[PDB]
Assembly symmetry: D2
Homo-oligomer: 295 residues x 4
């Protein structure tokens, strides 16, 4: 037998950092969960019990905190690139670092109409994520994403004209509820190294904001023919607005809300045009994916 692939590191490293403005007294907090996995010339730790090649996962943990102390943690695309580059430069036998960061929301509180200097609220479990792969001699590949953005529209979704055969019971509809948890990922063109990532720093937050805005507006305004058709419209717009993105991927569950026929009870009318009360279904769910790139 032979080792075909190997990677190891530290997962679930929670990190908080505060920035304090001395002039204004305003504080800003960042909280993330970080995973770092390394690859390189480490096969002998597996095959020969040779620990000499292992940067201990505990040391990887220390490195994450030290790196956060000495560098900006925002945008996460930059922090992840700094962190991955550290490992491939510091250790001769480590040739790739894979950094995943999940950013948690701490949104500044408004008290009596004004922004509070040091108090924050978690408004939703929506996350902003990055996956950064730093590979020696092959540059830096960054995939940015938002996830856990849960939305619902109560009308202006349709689904008709699909294939009907002996396995089909679903009725065509011209008016249904559409609800989903949005997972959207935009993949950046390869960067040559950290200097190039630094050169594009302002584009990261702006592109996240664009992706989020296009997602919400398209969802709200599209008279949706299907999840497929609506998601493609989102992806097309993001690609149009940022030239440095190569592909956009969406993964959307279709979280079903079923009509409840109550006609058995005193002829009560609660279907079609009369539908007011619905039963949200926890499972199963549709799952629709697409990756959109450039012609």
């Amino acid at each position: 037998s032979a080792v075909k692939a190997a990677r190891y590191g530290k997962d679930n490293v929670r990190v908080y950092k505060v920035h304090k403005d001395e002039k204004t007294g305003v504080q800003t907090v960042y909280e993330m969960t970080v995973c770092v996995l390394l690859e390189g010339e480490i096969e002998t730790s597996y095959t020969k019990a040779d620990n000499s090649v292992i940067v201990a996962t505990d040391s990887i943990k220390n490195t994450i905190y030290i790196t956060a102390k000495q560098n900006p943690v925002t945008p996460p695309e930059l922090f992840g690139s700094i962190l991955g580059t550290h490992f491939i430069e510091k250790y001769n036998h480590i040739h790739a670092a894979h950094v995943n960061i999940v950013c948690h929301r701490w949104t500044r509180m408004d008290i009596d109409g004004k922004p509070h200097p040091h108090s924050f609220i978690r408004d939703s479990e929506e996350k902003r994520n990055v996956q950064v792969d730093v590979v020696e001699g092959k540059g830096i590949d960054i995939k940015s994403s938002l996830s856990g953005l849960t939305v619902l529209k109560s009308t202006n979704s349709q689904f008709w004209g699909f294939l009907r055969d002996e396995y089909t019971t679903l009725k065509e509809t011209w008016d249904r509820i559409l609800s989903t948890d949005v997972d959207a990922t935009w993949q950046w063109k390869n960067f040559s190294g950290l200097q190039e990532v630094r050169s594009h720093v302002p584009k990261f937050d702006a592109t996240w904001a664009t992706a989020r805005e296009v997602t919400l507006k398209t969802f709200a305004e599209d008279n949706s023919a299907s999840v497929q058709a609506t998601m493609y419209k989102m992806a097309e717009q993001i690609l149009a607005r940022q030239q440095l993105i190569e592909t956009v991927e969406y993964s959307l569950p279709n979280k079903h809300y079923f009509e409840i026929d109550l006609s058995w009870h005193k002829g009560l009318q609660n279907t079609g045009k009369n539908a007011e009360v619905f039963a949200p279904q926890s499972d199963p769910n549709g799952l629709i994916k697409c990756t959109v790139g450039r012609s």
Copy 2:
């Protein structure tokens, strides 16, 4: 042996209801999870296999949907009272109904500065809850709550002056992070029945809004001496603002964020006044509770 207590019913009943304004085209959605448990002269279903006394839990499920079809589902204090009253009036041998409702957030989307007529976002897993106990001949007891409101302040929390003995290692501090998930419950004076609940309908939403506002403002503005001291200030204010509340209960975890000493690495300074990077602790956590009533 004898049956000392018994209750049974349906849990985890998900319900969605849409309201459609014909004039304006505006739609408003409500989504809840409902539990209804009944008590009464039902001992023989347990002791003698006498199912004749059982209102099937499936029928309880049907009743929840029918009731939501025929009645307002907001405020949840009212809906829960209607639902509980139904069971004690309809069935001679059922003498108490216990209704728990969890309300999920569907907040209207703002697109391009304006409120969208039929699109919604789940902004946070914060819930608004009610527990309604409808007991034949003893009226209606309602406990209203908010839960899952997660907040953090990065300074203006202290903790010193506590008992020190041979079990104590904690250092006194004049500046720490304070973060919690707020669970707050206000208990209404007993209502004589549904007519009385109806008479107070406007107070329910207003008191929820007050409770939330007092919680956020007090948390943000108090230079906190302890979780104990800050929570008492919250409770005192809520009681002052609504005469029909008898008690307020808070249950607050203290979600610890630890300093990280980095001095072992190149004398890096990251403690006390120099603390910038912290380690959020998943467990253990402080848990602090208090029930405040009137003198």
Copy 3:
């Protein structure tokens, strides 16, 4: 306003302890999650910011580890009683301690037919729990439980003869699936203090074993008329087998598995006597409770 009730302490304290037999080389591990909440003359920490009355929750955490170091951690009824008694005896102004322990399974591995000396498997998320309330001058109240015991029987469950009215759609049945997650609690007679708890130590493990065995055998062998009727049979037997128990409480969800009518597809027969494929329902679920005591 006044403080009507208050308790505070440390939750989610994970503890592991190993016992090593020097003669045999056999090791035995215990893992628990512990919560300790204190009550007493502590109102002024809430009302006056007087921290002098607060045993810091961090110190409570230290005390749990020290107590586990110096005492047996099994049976958990004993450990919880030692731990609660410590707080009321050590601190003059603390008058009640409430200790909750969840015990996690680490079952010795069998390798090649023999028990391994130091390797363990988590066979299921079933837990054994205790709640111990130690109240100065009122002794020690212990509630022991098992929870998360998930079972299913594929036949020999019936449900017919229930109330039918205009809210009823459920069909009577003489053969259904019954599946539940068992939560069973037995409440001990009050103990005068630690000496009395010590005197009954062997009864704790034996009664847990009895409760578990009676639950499984009754579930498997009863031709169940309802969840109500089967659960009562369990409780009756436990009370008969241990005189020192005052009450037994069961809380059982009815986890529904629905028939799937496939007759629309080529007349396929999959209902009643022909039912082979079913759809497990995640929600809603029946919830049935009863507390059984002595005549």
Copy 4:
């Protein structure tokens, strides 16, 4: 823009099936959660709102139940292959089906020493999984796995001899706790189609059993130099025992249990040779992966 990749289908489809032996009265249950995602000539549903190419996800759901009715659901490698083949053969424009099955444990109860005919227990959340990719003209690729197998050994794990530099604080050790949740995947050689999968049916259960046995025995008996070294020993043995496997992949968290220094309290000794009470750490955790193949 262009569609670069697309797949869609139904996730989280819960399925239960019972087999009833008429001669013996013995019943056997199977419960699974199934996901099926399709690919093919479906781009126009995304780009042109052309639903004519869409096999509705609801129909995919129906197909799963019908297929379970008409075919064995065990071993899951076979069921997944039947299910995936159905879609590529039935629909001309569908060219790949991706089937994921999670099998849940329902283990026959032993009552009074004998196996019960129709009662089952969920002994642990360990799962047996398959991923089956059926691709038109390219055969059937099957990855089988076990996951959620949680184990701990209290001694006979070491970790010393790792790289030490200015980022390192971890002390070398010759005796520690090792605990993990095992995720192990074996990838079968490509099969030409369903006839070939059928020809190997007995190997599926036998190889799962082997993988599980080798995992448990190696974990228990290895005097572990590292997670890396122990996991490689597992993989090597599985490959040796089944020629039709091409690669074995393990992904193992290192779930840390920390010593607790209690020496500050009355000189209490609880470290090194005196360590009895430990603090399980929920996070962070090491994560160690390797894929082993044939020379």
